[PDB]
């Protein structure tokens, strides 16, 4: 009923390893330089071709981000585990669990934000001063939606793409009937 | 009496007590050493306005006595006054050289002015203008 | 480069002025010091770089450089680098600076 | 050096306004060492009065 | 947050710059607190008003104020939100009103008179330069 | 405390080769030799600080990067070097640098 699909800006999933790792040994084994040891207790790496980000804690409890695809994140975690075993430490692939998916899209028409905020005043929340976008948190399912004037709808909260599109057609009629002009 | 109190006696009572200083050298030993941070505040010449009243979400009108009298205002004029590092260091031995502004003419308040004063509007009216302002000559 | 040439003359005069005291406390003659001197000149004319007055892991002719910096930043693929006080050996030509910039983009 | 001088303005403006409206000659502290009939309301029954 | 909510619901709209100049609350925790007060009062249950304070600070008669109200409502009606909190273009409504008159209130003065950017003033001047058509009443 | 990175240059290579020839000659003490190299690191530091003035700039594309501690794995492929007059075309350039502010 939307007539358009939203696009995803990031996929953030949690892939553990279940294996203790040593970040400074990784640093000495590394091929890299942008890090402050006195800045974070988990190492960050973005590999080249998928541009995906890993946050590796000392026990291999890691949350993937920077990914646009679930299988891309899975092969990224596989590449990371391959890197760790090439270093010489165990890293077995473990559960690929998504905790958040980031998406953004446009609908390209003027909108009645005051009407939206006043009428939808259960979850809608808008101020024009500090931000040009509304804050909306529908609870079934618990998905947070943000509403630009220009139709930039940045989407987050869903743990799966089908639910984030389910949010998109959940919000499409109430967006469409609250247009300006 | 009022004119005397406005022309003089006010600048006098300000200038008799203008100075207020917290010049901080160290107020203990060290601090290594430190320098004499002259935090000084002093008042200079003062200023007085015409009677002048704002309201909420409003302009600040030039008042007039009949309009004040109808709207229960208080025929008052504002007062606002000027306000005034470059130091001298002492370590223990020797001494006697242990000696701010950043703005100008800050507001201090408004006083009720008296009718027909020097600074009232009505001390300069012609009869015709006085009739135009709608109060009795 | 006359600027590069005079830079290497300054550094070679600085090192030969520095080593005088050290090899005199070592107690060795000036003849061995001149031997180190003309070994230095034959090595620099052997390199012949500049016109002189005389997978996913770690894997000469390659062009080498060293310097210091001020600040480095990126715009998501494109790292911009500030450089100062350094020397580059570029394609068998050696050049120095007190300031430089690297304008490169990582793909 | 700015925010407190405005409440300062409120204090002196409030004090003068209170003293002249009431007639007690002292600040808003229940009239110590003060006099009462100092600021009566103008009598306007007759020009002579 | 409580002061701004009460003062706003008394229909006395005050600028966030003035609130921050009176009390600096780093503009962020202030915003989060405003949202939670909004939510609390929501559970327990005006841009046009800004102009007279600024023309009060500039000292102009009633007719530029009325012109400012008319131009603000008309430019609000059509298009060009144009500015990320369009209090700026609300101000340049007064700027084009005083260019419609002939009183020297130059933008170089106005920028520090209102603690506002002169480049934003000129951008509003341009976006109203191409949109002169229906903004003047008589 | 100053870094000993000044040996990767041609001058550093020639100096280390000559001092290795003298160590093979067996005429220079080892601790004396490290003190000697430290003195070169100092004097080369101030003479590169003050005995150079001009500006040359290289423009290219990176292919080596990452996130570790400050030993910059930077390689620029297919870059261009010009000075102040002379324009130099480059196929591959290595860049490694480390901290420039004095770390206490």
So where are chain B's domains?
Answer: 1-137
Six-digit token string for F99 = 């901290």
- D24 to chain B nearest CA, in Å? 16
Long-range contacts, C78-87 (Cβ 8 Å, 24+):
C78/C104, C78/C105, C78/C106, C79/C104, C79/C105, C79/C106, C79/F62, C79/F65, C79/F74, C81/F74, C81/F95, C83/F97, C84/F100, C85/F48, C85/F49, C85/F52, C86/F48, C86/F97, C87/F9, C87/F48
A154 reaches F (C-beta below 8 A): no
Six-digit token string for E124 = 């509003």
By C-alpha distance, the chain F residue nearest C91 is F90
Inspect the interface and report whether the beta carbons of A35 and F70 lie closer than 8 Å. yes
- Of the candidates C63, C79, C94, which has its C-beta nearest F94's C-beta? C63
Cβ(A38)–Cβ(A133) below 8 Å: no
So where are chain F's domains?
Answer: 1-53, 54-100
- Of the candidates D1, D6, D17, which has its C-beta nearest B102's C-beta? D1
A127 reaches E (C-beta below 8 A): yes
Q: Which CATH fold topology does E49-130 show?
A: Cyclin A; domain 1 (1.10.472)
Inspect the interface and report whether the beta carbons of B58 and E13 lie closer than 8 Å. no
Q: What's A125's domain CATH number? A: 3.30.310.10
Inspect the interface and report whether the beta carbons of C22 and F32 lie closer than 8 Å. yes
Inspect the interface and report whether the beta carbons of F66 and A27 lie closer than 8 Å. no
Count of CB atoms situated within 10 Å of the CB of E25 = 15
Q: Distance (Å, rounded) from C-alpha A18 to C-alpha A89?
A: 12
Please indicate, yes or no, whether residues A82 and A108 belong to a single structural domain of this protein.
Answer: no
A5 reaches E (C-beta below 8 A): no
All residues at 6 or more sequence positions from A92 whose CB lies less than 8 Å from its CB, including other chains: A17, A18, A19, A81
Method: cryo-EM
Say whether the peptide bond before residue B72 is cis (omega within 30 degrees of 0). Answer: no
Inspect the interface and report whether the beta carbons of A83 and C56 lie closer than 8 Å. yes
Cβ(C67)–Cβ(C95) below 8 Å: no
B127 reaches E (C-beta below 8 A): no
The answer for A 61-120 residues in CB contact with F (under 8 A) is none
A149 reaches E (C-beta below 8 A): yes
Which among A47, A80, A98 is the end of a domain?
A: A98
CATH architecture of C1-54: Orthogonal Bundle (1.10)
Residue C48 DSSP one-character state: -
Question: Which residue in B97, B123, B84 sits closest to B6, CA to CA?
Answer: B123
- A117 to chain E nearest CA, in Å? 12
**Secondary structure element (H or E) that encloses residue A85, with its range:** helix A70-87
Long-range contacts, F85-90 (Cβ 8 Å, 24+):
F86/C1, F88/C90, F88/C91, F88/C93, F90/C63, F90/C90, F90/C91, F90/F58, F90/F60
Say whether the peptide bond before residue E18 is cis (omega within 30 degrees of 0). Answer: no
> Could you tell me which CATH class the domain F54-100 is placed in?
mainly beta
Q: Distance (Å, rounded) from C-alpha F80 to C-alpha E15?
A: 53
Inspect the interface and report whether the beta carbons of F67 and A31 lie closer than 8 Å. no
Q: Distance (Å, rounded) from C-alpha A47 to C-alpha A54?
A: 9
Q: Best mutation site among A27, A30, A32, A33 for testing chain F: the one with the most F CBs within 10 Å?
A: A33
Please indicate, yes or no, whether residues A104 and A179 belong to a single structural domain of this protein.
Answer: yes
All residues at 6 or more sequence positions from C27 whose CB lies less than 8 Å from its CB, including other chains: none
By C-alpha distance, the chain E residue nearest A148 is E84
Cα separation values, A177 from A55, A78, F16, Å? 42, 46, 78
Chains with 3 or more CB pairs under 8 A to chain C: A, F
With beta carbons under 8 A apart, name residues in chain D contacting B108: 5, 8-9, 12
Phi, psi of F20 (to 5 degrees): -70, -35
Cβ(E52)–Cβ(B58) below 8 Å: yes
Cβ(A124)–Cβ(A135) below 8 Å: yes
What number of C-beta contacts closer than 8 Å exist between B and D? 32
- Of the candidates E31, E79, E86, which has its C-beta nearest A130's C-beta? E31
All residues at 6 or more sequence positions from B9 whose CB lies less than 8 Å from its CB, including other chains: none
So where are chain C's domains?
Answer: 1-54, 55-107
Domain total in chain A? 2
All residues at 6 or more sequence positions from F48 whose CB lies less than 8 Å from its CB, including other chains: C85, C86, C87, C96, C98
The answer for B 60-89 residues in CB contact with E (under 8 A) is 60
- A113 to chain E nearest CA, in Å? 12
* Resolution value, angstrom units: 3.7
Chains with 3 or more CB pairs under 8 A to chain D: B
* Domain extent for A78: 13-98
Cα separation values, F34 from A90, F6, F38, F40, F48, Å? 41, 14, 6, 10, 21
Cβ(C21)–Cβ(C13) below 8 Å: no
Chains with 3 or more CB pairs under 8 A to chain A: C, E, F
Block residue for tokens 């003047």: E136
Please indicate, yes or no, whether residues A24 and A91 belong to a single structural domain of this protein.
Answer: yes
Inspect the interface and report whether the beta carbons of B59 and E56 lie closer than 8 Å. yes
Question: Which residue in D37, D9, D20 sits closest to B113, CA to CA?
Answer: D20
Cβ(C18)–Cβ(C33) below 8 Å: no
By C-alpha distance, the chain E residue nearest B60 is E56
With beta carbons under 8 A apart, name residues in chain A contacting E31: 127, 130
By C-alpha distance, the chain C residue nearest F102 is C68
For residue C83, count CB atoms less than 10 angstroms from its CB and return exposed for 0-12, middle for 13-18, buried for 19 or more.
buried
- D35 to chain B nearest CA, in Å? 20
Please indicate, yes or no, whether residues A65 and A130 belong to a single structural domain of this protein.
Answer: no
What are the E-state strand segments in chain C? Answer: 64-75, 78-89, 94-97, 99-103
- The domain over range C55-107 is classified in CATH as 3.40.640.10: no
CATH architecture of F1-53: Orthogonal Bundle (1.10)
- Of the candidates A31, A37, A45, which has its C-beta nearest F69's C-beta? A37
The answer for F 61-80 residues in CB contact with A (under 8 A) is 64-74
């Amino acid at each position: 009923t939307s007539g358009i699909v939203p696009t995803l800006q990031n996929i953030v999933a949690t892939v553990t390893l279940g294996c203790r790792l040593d970040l400074k040994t990784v640093a000495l084994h590394a091929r890299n330089a942008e890090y402050n040891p006195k800045r974070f207790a988990a190492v960050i790496m973005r590999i080249r071709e998928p541009k995906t980000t890993a946050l590796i804690f000392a026990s291999g409890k890691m949350v993937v981000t920077g990914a646009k695809s679930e299988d891309d994140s899975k092969l990224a975690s596989r590449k990371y585990a391959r890197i760790i075993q090439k270093i010489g430490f165990a890293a077995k692939f473990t559960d690929f669990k998504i905790q958040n998916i980031v998406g953004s899209c446009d609908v390209k028409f003027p909108i009645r934000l005051e009407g939206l905020a006043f009428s939808h005043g259960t979850f809608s929340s808008y101020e024009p001063e500090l931000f040009p976008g509304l804050i909306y948190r529908m609870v079934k399912p618990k998905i947070v939606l943000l509403i630009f004037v220009s139709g930039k709808i940045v989407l987050t909260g869903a743990k799966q793409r089908e639910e984030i599109y389910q949010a998109f057609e959940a919000i499409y009629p109430v967006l469409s009937e609250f247009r300006k002009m | 009496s009022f004119n005397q109190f406005v022309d003089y006696t006010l600048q006098d009572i300000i200038c008799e007590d203008s100075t207020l200083i917290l010049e901080q050298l160290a107020q203990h030993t060290t601090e290594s050493d430190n320098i004499s941070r002259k935090y000084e505040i002093s008042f200079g010449k003062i200023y007085v306005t015409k009677p002048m009243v704002n309201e909420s979400d409003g302009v600040t009108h030039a008042l007039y006595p009949q309009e004040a009298r109808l709207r229960n205002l208080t025929y008052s004029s504002g007062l606002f006054v000027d306000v005034k590092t470059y130091e001298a260091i002492d370590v223990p031995g020797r001494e006697l050289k242990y000696e701010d502004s950043e703005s100008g003419k800050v507001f201090i308040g408004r006083l009720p002015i008296m009718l027909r004063s020097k600074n009232c509007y009505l001390s300069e009216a012609t009869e015709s203008d006085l009739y135009k302002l709608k109060e009795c000559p | 480069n006359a600027e590069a040439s005079r830079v290497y003359e300054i550094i070679v005069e600085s090192v030969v002025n520095e080593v005088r005291e050290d090899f005199e406390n070592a107690g060795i003659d000036e003849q061995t010091l001149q031997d180190l001197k003309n070994i230095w000149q034959k090595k620099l004319t052997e390199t012949k770089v500049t016109t002189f007055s005389w997978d996913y892991l770690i894997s000469p002719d390659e062009n080498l450089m060293l310097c210091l910096y001020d600040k480095v930043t990126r715009t998501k693929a494109r790292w911009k680098c500030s450089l100062k006080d350094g020397v580059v050996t570029i394609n068998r030509n050696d050049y120095t600076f007190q300031k430089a910039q690297v304008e490169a983009e990582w793909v | 050096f700015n925010m407190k001088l405005a409440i300062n303005a409120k204090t002196i403006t409030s004090g003068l306004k209170y003293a002249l409206a009431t007639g007690n000659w002292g600040e808003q502290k229940k009239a110590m060492s003060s006099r009462a009939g100092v600021s009566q309301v103008l009598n306007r029954y007759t020009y002579s009065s | 947050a409580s002061i701004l909510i009460g003062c706003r619901r008394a229909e006395v709209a005050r600028t966030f710059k003035e609130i921050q100049s009176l009390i600096h609350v780093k503009t962020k925790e202030f915003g989060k607190t405003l949202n939670i007060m909004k939510n609390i009062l929501r559970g327990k249950s005006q841009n046009l008003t800004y102009i007279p304070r600024f023309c009060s600070h500039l000292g102009l008669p009633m007719q530029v104020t009325t012109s400012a109200e008319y131009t603000a409502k008309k430019c609000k009606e059509i298009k060009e939100i144009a500015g990320k909190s369009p209090i700026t273009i609300a101000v340049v409504s007064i700027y084009l009103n005083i260019l419609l008159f002939q009183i020297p209130i130059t933008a170089a003065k106005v920028g520090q008179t209102l603690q506002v950017t002169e480049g934003t003033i000129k951008s509003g001047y341009k976006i109203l330069y191409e949109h002169r058509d229906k903004l003047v009443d008589p | 405390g100053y870094y000993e990175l000044y040996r990767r240059s041609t001058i550093g290579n020639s100096l280390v080769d000559a001092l290795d020839t003298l160590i093979s000659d067996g005429r220079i003490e080892a601790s004396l030799a490290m003190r000697v190299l430290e003195t070169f690191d100092k004097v080369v530091a101030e003479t590169l600080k003050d005995n150079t003035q001009s500006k040359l700039t290289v423009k290219g594309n990176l292919d080596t990067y990452g996130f570790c501690d400050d030993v910059w794995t930077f390689i620029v492929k297919n870059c261009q070097v010009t000075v102040e007059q002379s324009v130099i075309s480059v196929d591959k350039l290595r860049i490694v640098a480390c901290n420039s502010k004095k770390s206490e």
